[PDB]
Structure 1
Amino acid sequence: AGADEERAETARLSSFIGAIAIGDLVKSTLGPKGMDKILLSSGRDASLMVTNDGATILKNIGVDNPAAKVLVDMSRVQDDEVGDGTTSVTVLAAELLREAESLIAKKIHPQTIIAGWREATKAARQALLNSAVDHGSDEVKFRQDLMNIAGTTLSSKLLTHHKDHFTKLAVEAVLRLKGSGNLEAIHVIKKLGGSLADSYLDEGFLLDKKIGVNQPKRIENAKILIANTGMDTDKIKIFGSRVRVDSTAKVAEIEHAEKEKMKEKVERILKHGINCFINRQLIYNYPEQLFGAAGVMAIEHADFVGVERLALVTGGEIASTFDHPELVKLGSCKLIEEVMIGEDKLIHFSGVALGEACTIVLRGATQQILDEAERSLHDALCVLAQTVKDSRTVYGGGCSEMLMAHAVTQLASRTPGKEAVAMESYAKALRMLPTIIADNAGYDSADLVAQLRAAHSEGKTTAGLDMKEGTIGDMSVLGITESFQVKRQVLLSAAEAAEVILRVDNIIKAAPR
């Protein structure tokens, strides 16, 4: 057979190769000095999807025969829990792959060596429950609200000429979001128009449709009715049936029934004094005439997600067949008007008394890079949520790493002769991160390690690699803080994934063709 089977060192190399390739591209992306890449692929690949976020591309493609896609895959969970914020975990994991050659030199029991992960277990556990992340965030928080981590996530990000401002707004959003609400009811999109502003925060929900061109322009003191049951009429669950009659006269009654549906809609809508009908699904037309006549606006097929958020925003109802008006509903009235943004016409539901949910309408010149806003906004949303939840962070800019490197170095000898070697390799691995951030900086790296190691060993924890400074600076001042989450999950994830590669010996796969 053509099945590819590898054992021992050959199998290890497969693992050896995968980590290295990822690191150069990944390494370049990091933080303030990080870079954007464009990936063009043939079908099914439309163009070059440029991505500031490392994770997205990794998730998207399982390009070649080298194993790794699974490795790539895990990081997503870390982002759900946290992120992000900026890719870093993978590179460090990759470097760990490095010593095993010296490990061939170890020429003893590699599995004995794996005792490293327990050490990592230690290493990971210790900063966890040890040392410090973040103090106050009084809340909502005047100032602490942003110009920080949002900008750091954004840092590697291409967007942040304008982007830092975008990232900054995110904290306002988090502030509105705060409470036991969980994460829900926030809607985002971007727009094809220019404004230095680059984006808008809407006090309510933004949607895009028209009931009828006919109908009224804007609605005030709007009575909002959401309907589960679209207006469509006739059939049931017996078609009952395609049909014929004891004279055309009989048909007259059938025509009459539609009127009943119509009349019912007209009768109670008026009592409400009805302004708007949002039907997350197609509507049946007699109301179409009646509404336009009415002073009311329908949104035929207003898709569901925004309907639910709009529930959170408004007061709602229970809708609910046509008994749905009124108090069955709760309609919120600031103003619902269809406006032109630029550009495409959207409907703005606003002055929601609730305030629990809002929207962000991005504005951009336009393009896939505008779609970079698409790359962008998501990144921004997750990090903020984590920061709010954790109530814990860490000094960014290489601070954390340098400290861990110092502490970890103690660890190998803290461990025994065999174990020391493994544990020490783990610690040294810590060193690259100082090399990388600084390297993106444009400053000489070797000096970077030395100065940074001195400042950190000092215990001035806050000192990090200040790219701006070009040396090591006070991260606290800069505001680069890493979520407590990012560091923790990376430590844990890194050990396990690395071991799995190493733990497995005989790698088996069949030839595609």
Structure 2
Amino acid sequence: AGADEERAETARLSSFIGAIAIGDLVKSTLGPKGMDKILLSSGRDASLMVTNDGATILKNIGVDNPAAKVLVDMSRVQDDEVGDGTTSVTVLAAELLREAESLIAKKIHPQTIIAGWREATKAARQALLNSAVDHGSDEVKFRQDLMNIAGTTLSSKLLTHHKDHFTKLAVEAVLRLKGSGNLEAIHVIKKLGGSLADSYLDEGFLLDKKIGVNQPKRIENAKILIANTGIEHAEKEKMKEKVERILKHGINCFINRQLIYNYPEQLFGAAGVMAIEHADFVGVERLALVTGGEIASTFDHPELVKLGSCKLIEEVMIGEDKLIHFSGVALGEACTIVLRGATQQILDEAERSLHDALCVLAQTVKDSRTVYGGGCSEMLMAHAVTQLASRTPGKEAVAMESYAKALRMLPTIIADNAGYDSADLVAQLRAAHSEGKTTAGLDMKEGTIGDMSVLGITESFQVKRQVLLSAAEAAEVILRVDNIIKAAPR
């Protein structure tokens, strides 16, 4: 019995196998003609889920015993500090494993080769302090607001026929957001059709729930109540405490993130108050920043321990469907985007695309710098790294040389998803980068190579800094160790 018991060639292999399975899956996802996947599980799961984003799908399920879940976990921190771009970092880490094949030819000590990872730290610093960046971005900016990185995230999605316009909208959202603190208060939902604009911008948070059939149709000078919490005669007292406190405030709406007792429900309708059952917590937190918030506790909650925004809360209909809109936020820090869309199922993919937009833009505004997208950055660095291996001494250099060829796979994945032959694309791509043009990259729409800058496609500066360091450290854990697993059972 025991646990693990691995040594020799077999031990290397378990790590090696995990990398290959994940790389093919994520490979489809990258670039303009990315592949959407629907997941079917009948193991304490109810329906097929479709996730374009590679990071979200890896996080959701830990299918088996081999190590890979922890490597996957790290990518999420990256998403909040810079966002998704297109998933590429996981693939590069995996290809590090493949040259281990030439390593059995070493037949002596693999550990000496490990010196390359230390070398990698020198290399990571070589791109972060080198080729990238842009000149401009003074805060807000009339035209430099976007027409950039949002577009590269979009270009990976087909909807960029009318959708590139949607992307333009997203930075209006970031300019309003900045101010007081990070990224959190933004909510996005896609509608089913009817617009050339394909989108609308809302003043406040958008919600979709009802108390019940009975209750007032509409409210005015609405005041908002949020609760963290949901002898027989004493039951009446709960009814009465709620009514007594309620009437003075003029309470127009109540929002609760959970199940709600039947007695109060009745009362709200006669009073002229609309309540919400099991309101999503995420919606509530966004709403709190917007309304000035409150402190959620016991029935002592109504009055000045509560802050209510006073413009207008009503259930309204747009084009055809009926939704409930919270509007008139003094804060301005948090707003909501409602996409009417040009009635197509591509529109149903608007939710897919805007979510990607949400993480990318917040980071883009505070990083204050960017890189050239479309794989422009990867080929340039690849030409340069071939030289780098030759500068170092033979023990360090061999590991460094392998790292350099890793960048080669990205050009193929970007073009292959485009639909143009991958083999042809690599040759022409390398030649333009070699000349010295940073701007030049892969034009997926063309199927060849072109000027990335005209497109407006740029990558956040931060995505490049974090991934280079992360790839090396994860790799080190695997090769230096031939026997591992973890503590506790039996």
The question of a shared fold, defined as TM-score above 0.5 by the shorter chain, is answered with: yes
How has the CA–CA distance of structure 1 residues 368 and 17 changed in structure 2, closer, same or farther, with 3 Å as cutoff? farther
How has the CA–CA distance of structure 1 residues 406 and 296 changed in structure 2, closer, same or farther, with 3 Å as cutoff? same
How has the CA–CA distance of structure 1 residues 63 and 155 changed in structure 2, closer, same or farther, with 3 Å as cutoff? farther
Kindly state the Cα deviation for residue 117 of structure 1 after the two structures are TM-superposed: 0.9
Kindly state the Cα deviation for residue 188 of structure 1 after the two structures are TM-superposed: 2.6
Kindly state the Cα deviation for residue 109 of structure 1 after the two structures are TM-superposed: 2.8
Using the alignment, how far apart are the partners of 1:25 and 1:82 within structure 2? 22
How has the CA–CA distance of structure 1 residues 495 and 330 changed in structure 2, closer, same or farther, with 3 Å as cutoff? closer
Greater displacement, 201-210 / 42-51: 42-51
Greater displacement, 168-177 / 494-503: 168-177
Kindly state the Cα deviation for residue 379 of structure 1 after the two structures are TM-superposed: 2.5
Kindly state the Cα deviation for residue 174 of structure 1 after the two structures are TM-superposed: 1.4
Using the alignment, how far apart are the partners of 2:351 and 2:489 within structure 1? 35
Using the alignment, how far apart are the partners of 1:311 and 1:154 within structure 2? 31
Residues 264-295 of structure 1: per-residue CA shift (max 9 Å, x gap): 66566555444334455666677656643444
Kindly state the Cα deviation for residue 191 of structure 1 after the two structures are TM-superposed: 4.2
Question: Do the aligned residues in 2 keep the contact of 1:205 with 1:350 (CA within 8 Å)?
Answer: yes
Residues 104-148 of structure 1: per-residue CA shift (max 9 Å, x gap): 223343211111111211110122222332332333233333333
Kindly state the Cα deviation for residue 346 of structure 1 after the two structures are TM-superposed: 3.3
Kindly state the Cα deviation for residue 368 of structure 1 after the two structures are TM-superposed: 11
Question: Do the aligned residues in 1 keep the contact of 2:372 with 2:457 (CA within 8 Å)?
Answer: yes
Question: Do the aligned residues in 1 keep the contact of 2:170 with 2:361 (CA within 8 Å)?
Answer: yes
How has the CA–CA distance of structure 1 residues 259 and 452 changed in structure 2, closer, same or farther, with 3 Å as cutoff? closer
Residues 214-237 of structure 1: per-residue CA shift (max 9 Å, x gap): 43222223344445676xxxxxxx
Using the alignment, how far apart are the partners of 1:183 and 1:17 within structure 2? 37
Question: Do the aligned residues in 2 keep the contact of 1:313 with 1:354 (CA within 8 Å)?
Answer: yes
How has the CA–CA distance of structure 1 residues 221 and 24 changed in structure 2, closer, same or farther, with 3 Å as cutoff? same
Using the alignment, how far apart are the partners of 1:263 and 1:112 within structure 2? 77
Q: Gaps (5+ residues) in structure 2?
A: none
Using the alignment, how far apart are the partners of 2:366 and 2:302 within structure 1? 39
Kindly state the Cα deviation for residue 493 of structure 1 after the two structures are TM-superposed: 1.2
* Residue number in structure 1 paired with 2:177: 177
Question: Do the aligned residues in 2 keep the contact of 1:406 with 1:457 (CA within 8 Å)?
Answer: yes
TM-score under structure 2 length normalisation:
0.85
How has the CA–CA distance of structure 1 residues 112 and 333 changed in structure 2, closer, same or farther, with 3 Å as cutoff? same
Kindly state the Cα deviation for residue 183 of structure 1 after the two structures are TM-superposed: 1.8
How has the CA–CA distance of structure 1 residues 46 and 128 changed in structure 2, closer, same or farther, with 3 Å as cutoff? same
Question: Do the aligned residues in 1 keep the contact of 2:33 with 2:157 (CA within 8 Å)?
Answer: no
How has the CA–CA distance of structure 1 residues 307 and 38 changed in structure 2, closer, same or farther, with 3 Å as cutoff? closer
Question: Do the aligned residues in 2 keep the contact of 1:52 with 1:157 (CA within 8 Å)?
Answer: no
How has the CA–CA distance of structure 1 residues 401 and 228 changed in structure 2, closer, same or farther, with 3 Å as cutoff? closer
- Residues 368-387 of structure 1 aligned to structure 2 (within 5 Å): 375-387=352-364
Q: Secondary structure at the match of 2:458?
A: coil
Question: Do the aligned residues in 1 keep the contact of 2:376 with 2:442 (CA within 8 Å)?
Answer: yes
Whether 1:456 aligns to 2:427 is no
How has the CA–CA distance of structure 1 residues 258 and 121 changed in structure 2, closer, same or farther, with 3 Å as cutoff? closer
Residues 138-193 of structure 1: per-residue CA shift (max 9 Å, x gap): 33233333333223223333554555444443222212211232223222334456
Question: Do the aligned residues in 1 keep the contact of 2:192 with 2:340 (CA within 8 Å)?
Answer: yes
Question: Do the aligned residues in 1 keep the contact of 2:189 with 2:338 (CA within 8 Å)?
Answer: yes
How has the CA–CA distance of structure 1 residues 283 and 454 changed in structure 2, closer, same or farther, with 3 Å as cutoff? closer
Residues 287-334 of structure 1: per-residue CA shift (max 9 Å, x gap): 656643444434455454433432322235556666655555443222
Greater displacement, 285-294 / 438-447: 285-294
Residues 392-438 of structure 1: per-residue CA shift (max 9 Å, x gap): 22111222112212322221111012322221222122222223223
Question: Do the aligned residues in 1 keep the contact of 2:132 with 2:377 (CA within 8 Å)?
Answer: no
Q: Secondary structure at the match of 1:406?
A: helix
How has the CA–CA distance of structure 1 residues 288 and 30 changed in structure 2, closer, same or farther, with 3 Å as cutoff? closer
How has the CA–CA distance of structure 1 residues 451 and 212 changed in structure 2, closer, same or farther, with 3 Å as cutoff? closer
Question: Do the aligned residues in 2 keep the contact of 1:50 with 1:372 (CA within 8 Å)?
Answer: no
Question: Do the aligned residues in 2 keep the contact of 1:462 with 1:475 (CA within 8 Å)?
Answer: yes
Residues 18-72 of structure 1: per-residue CA shift (max 9 Å, x gap): 3233333322322124323344344445454333212222223333565433333
Kindly state the Cα deviation for residue 484 of structure 1 after the two structures are TM-superposed: 1.6
Q: Secondary structure at the match of 1:135?
A: coil
Q: Secondary structure at the match of 1:326?
A: coil
Aligned length: 490
